[PDB]
Design a protein around this ligand. Sequence first.
Ligand SMILES: Cc1ccnc2c1NC(=O)c1cccnc1N2C1CC1
Lengths: 550, 405
Amino acid sequence: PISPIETVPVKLKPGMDGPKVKQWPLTEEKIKALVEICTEMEKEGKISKIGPENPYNTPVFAIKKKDSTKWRKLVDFRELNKRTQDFWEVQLGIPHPAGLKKKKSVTVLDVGDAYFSVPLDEDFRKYTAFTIPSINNIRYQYNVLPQGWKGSPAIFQSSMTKILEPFRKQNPDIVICQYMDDLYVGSDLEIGQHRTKIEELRQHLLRWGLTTPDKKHQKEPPFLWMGYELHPDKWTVQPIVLPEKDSWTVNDIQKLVGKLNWASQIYPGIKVRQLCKLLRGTKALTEVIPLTEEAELELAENREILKEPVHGVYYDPSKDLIAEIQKQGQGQWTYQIYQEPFKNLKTGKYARMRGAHTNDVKQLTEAVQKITTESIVIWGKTPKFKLPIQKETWETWWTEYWQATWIPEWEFVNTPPLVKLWYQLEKEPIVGAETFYVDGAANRETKLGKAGYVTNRGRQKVVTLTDTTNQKTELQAIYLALQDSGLEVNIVTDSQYALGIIQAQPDQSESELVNQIIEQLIKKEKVYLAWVPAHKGIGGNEQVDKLVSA
Amino acid sequence: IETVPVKLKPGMDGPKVKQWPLTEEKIKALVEICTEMEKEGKISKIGPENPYNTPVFAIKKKDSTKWRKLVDFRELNKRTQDFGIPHPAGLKKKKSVTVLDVGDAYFSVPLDEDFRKYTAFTIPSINNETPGIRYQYNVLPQGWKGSPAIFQSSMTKILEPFRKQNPDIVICQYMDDLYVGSDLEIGQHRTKIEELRQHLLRWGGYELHPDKWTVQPIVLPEKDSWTVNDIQKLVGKLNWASQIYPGIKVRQLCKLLRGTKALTEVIPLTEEAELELAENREILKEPVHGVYYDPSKDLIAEIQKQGQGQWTYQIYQEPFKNLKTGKYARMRGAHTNDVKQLTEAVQKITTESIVIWGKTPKFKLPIQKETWETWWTEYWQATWIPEWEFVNTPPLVKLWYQLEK
Ligand SMILES: Cc1ccnc2c1NC(=O)c1cccnc1N2C1CC1
């Protein structure tokens, strides 16, 4: 079954030459076999003997495939693959289960060794040369796509799309999806009708040397789709097995946390905090670790979660898309996309490493965005959103934030906890509030600093700092101010980072100190923050500022 | 026709840019659009043996509810050899200018066989249920820099008559568009324009107002009485501003600010401070001297969001030596979404840069990459695509321009 299809022109990378590697020596039985096997496809026209006019060579091997005490062959194109041009995209990204519309029925045709049905570019064939040695010290080359060579998949995919354009056209109410050597076909016809067509298709591929496993020997639903179990009217989350064991090695924990993390997507509730703690300091990937009781209760509670299997539904184009979001903790969000309430299409969660300085709204914002993207990738469209935030809140925040931001049509859902603004700086000074002129300075090299303040009420403080830095000093100045102020405060500072907070008003940060201030900001009733150019006369920057520079 | 050979700047290789996900709605439109151009033999299906790719997408101009296909050749233009096309300085002054979409023209002209591979692009498939759909151009593509180039000859011809019979009218072509400027009152301009269309059709509001784009001065507040705060705010701004006008002085004012007083405390101005201030207001009445466009350097465009629907910008080549600056108020209807406002803004500004220096500025956008990548196209309406980078607006450069008159 070679095929009568136009070969795709293939050439070697810019200015390189074919493979030239030596052939390993072989046992009497590793040569005997390969002679047989090769004489086989030799007769099938798949490979053709070559003379000495071919200077290339690839190492052929022989490994007896398991569950058959018979011999099989293997050719090592590592080198050839390094020398072969690149092709576009053998996989623009995988179709997710939630992006499929349901079907009355779905077959799958293993187009298996169709890799060998497609003839290789006559010109290129010469680089595929390999050698079968003899006992005490026989050449060939491929005439069809070799298994394991860079361009096969690619060449075979396109080949396939061509050969499918006709049948697809005639039968538009039918749906084929291809992937690898697996051809999935589904539809909404009546089983007998479906049956007929599949056969029709089969005899079509069958026409291009493309042998396919008959009805008598093909696969049947459910279908294990990398992670999922697929029925034509519902998919399932193929229950995950946590190895209950005696002693745990570091490596084991990692793998475990790995599978656990994967799970948290569909199973929010899953936790790995204490389990992660078990790695701190680990000296060897195989050193065994004592499972803290906290880690026990956790590992445990996780098995319970993974008990309940999870089935979902498919895409129904005649219904709107809804995306609902929840905040599980600081910078942790869960979302579920569905068409009919509680009938979920997809779910997920996100952990946001605080990074420099953020705030929940900003983070809420990023979630939406991420969701929006994957939605489009799947349903070529974006969901209407149900968000745990009030229009008032959102409005206040965005019209004022310094960065461009946006949230597609959405609707407030009162599912607590809601995301809110933890504090807001006053737009102008507070009348009848103490005014703290803060300043901080530190010796860059010796890391010795002082921080402090003086108010218009005559109050003052100063503090000496060991092993500190400038930024810290400045911030500290501000921390103190806040600590000693009271519900309403006015604070002038010449800090560049103060400018930061003002413009962003973050409610989370990597810097503990910042967090400190943030906590203090939140406590205050009314706070107004002001910045003035450093080292200028601006009193305050002259008095508390003078006390801290030498 | 006989085709001119186009090549890549030496050393370069074709573009291999990934396709961005597209909505169902626009993927459909592109298919239609492509099957058609295919028949029309403008484009042809390609195999995987071709590894180059450029992003594609669809948009709709105003007063057009018919989808239009747009490609992102930036990368390819960057890699396409240069050749030399002349820019006036007249429309810069015209009383009015009108832009014209002559992208079509190109589809008549064929493209050198060997450069075609480089023009490969891909229509994706929703959820990847199908493999993508690869095409490649056979004629001059719209949006490519080589196209207005190769179609130069024919173009000049086609126009000369309208040219010679109207040397009082300016015509500048920048890629897919044609800029027509005349001081003739609107009546004659509009009519003369339509006459020009016909002149072209023959072969096979909306108005612009150049002049009027005068840079604005930085006005300073005025109060009956000033507070510690007011001053501090003022002084802060002046201080920073001195980087532009070095004659600005702040000491007399900073003197009043000595002593730890309350922000709300009122302070009367010394006659010395009064002067220092009056003297500053003067210097600010006009743009800094010495700023002259340099054709050999990149034009830069910075945008600050001011909130309330307002945005400010500055075109320059060297920080603080602005060539142009300005304010922009949100178009009627974008009352809830930033991204819409920003693209509109981006487009208007690019426009001016073209009209003026006949060159697209590189943008410095106050928006997170992801946000921008996800939605800019949704509101884009120009055949060209400028360069951009994403940044963090310093708080000061913002308070400054907020002060523009
Ligand atoms: C794994 C896979 C990838 C893409 N599409 C499908 C499948 N397999 C199915 O079993 C399936 C299930 C439900 C709907 N379409 C399906 N099919 C469609 C092709 C008939």
